[PDB]
Amino acid sequence: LADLFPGFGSEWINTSSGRIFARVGGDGPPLLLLHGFPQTHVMWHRVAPKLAERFKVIVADLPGYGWSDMPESDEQHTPYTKRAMAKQLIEAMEQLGHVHFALAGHNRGARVSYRLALDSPGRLSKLAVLDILPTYEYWQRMNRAYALKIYHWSFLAQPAPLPENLLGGDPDFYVKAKLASWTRAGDLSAFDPRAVEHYRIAFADPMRRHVMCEDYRAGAYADFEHDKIDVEAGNKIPVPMLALWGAPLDVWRKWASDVQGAPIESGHFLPEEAPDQTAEALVRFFS
Template sequence: MKRLANSLFSGFEERRVTLPQTDFAVLVGGSGPPVLLLHGYPETRSAWHRIAPHLLSSHTVVVPDLPGYGWSRVLQTSTGSGSKRWMGNQLHAMMRELGHHHYAVVGHDRGGRVGYRLALDFPEAVTAYVSVTVVPTPEMWEGSSKAFGMGAWHWFALAQPEPLAETLLSGNPRMILDSSLNKMAQGIARLHPLAIEDYRIAFDDPSVRHAICEDYRAGATVDEADDLVDRAKRRKITVPVLVFWEAGRRYGGGREPLDIWADWANDVSGKGLEGGHMLPETAPGEILEILLPFLRRVWHAPSA
């Protein structure tokens, strides 16, 4: 498959990091404290092309495709493959392979779910966590409604057993993709043409669509179970958390995102932004205005 992400990331080097279970396609650039950028559905690492270059002067920036998404391949499945805990384990091993034992995580959408799992499971490694348009998975399911189901139909459809979900996506992948992008970006024309084409090429691949379905199946099962265990034990994210959300968005019971995250983390700040769901591409300037000072404030050089 043709790789278009490189054209959007001046100053980055294409790397492959091969682990026993995952072969990662990753872009790396810059120098300084490491920052791991994680994309969401139905995207690839290209989702960060309006954010990542602006971090190069102050940070080492690592931008992978999530396992199974884009050009990162799952080589060997195991119990829990597709879960956010499994993805987090793979990404943590990837960062260590790149020489980064401490790093901040910025995650959008599905990548945001992997990101908070990393912060919970590897508190000795994650120095800060940034959530973009995400609240924890149990909060989403518990607050679900007719409006949520109509607006986020893929949460339910893609979690259906194999091969039903894969068959549904195979009928007209590009129509489904473009419809999703148009809705989430509040107009597909707001996205860069090369990013759109990168998403289309990846989504054309049946193996990518299968990995996406496995991601959503985990979200309806093991991911929720893992989060509920942590919530029952009152485990919290101990590093600073920055939250961006869609302006005006409320969750189950009309709760504010900051109030929800205060139940899951000790140090939470953030802001609602205009631009729909795909804020890294539709509101990059507003994100960077807050993200860069946050990363400077929270970084400390941990002891080895």
């Protein structure tokens, strides 16, 4: 497994729920970067150096993902809810003395990030979300077309052990196919092979796959209900925020009072498919 973060250290950060693994590099204002599914912190490897020219960059594995410890889940999926994950990452950031920081997230990590912003806006100076809409919005959009496109939101949310059983036959296939299918190219050619190996190794562990299913179960149930409370109360994120998407601002303006955004010429995996454009947009925004 390759070290794809030149000039970054490696830290296990203690919390009350378990250690968070992170790569840490740079100097200046602090910036946390959160990956999603089916990836690890490594996804940020093409953009984190650019950001570290200006910021102290913390590139964390989500709770239960990568090298982070796996808290024990429960019937309501609680440690893998985005509220819970956000609380754990706030604790981790406190261990570093960061109580007000910038945050960028992608995929599940972006969901942690907007939930963090809704629950604890004082923690964030600025927020960026990469290629997502709020969980509530995806569920509200879940007609035939969406059910077919984002089938994994309901498949992975089926009660255990259904998805776990199926995934264990040929995990490597599935992860590689999901990586590829979500890119513009529809193959793996946008990824560094070393990064793909990180993703594959993580996905090969049944306990790590189980976490991912718990994350999607939370996405279908508690996360949805947490979002629904905010939409019903008319709550909006006050934190200055950037929404980037792969070629949404209308949607985010319903959720956030100070939001800007732009399409990036990319499939889903912006930091790997479009690293120069992504980095430039993030540096400009967070400066």
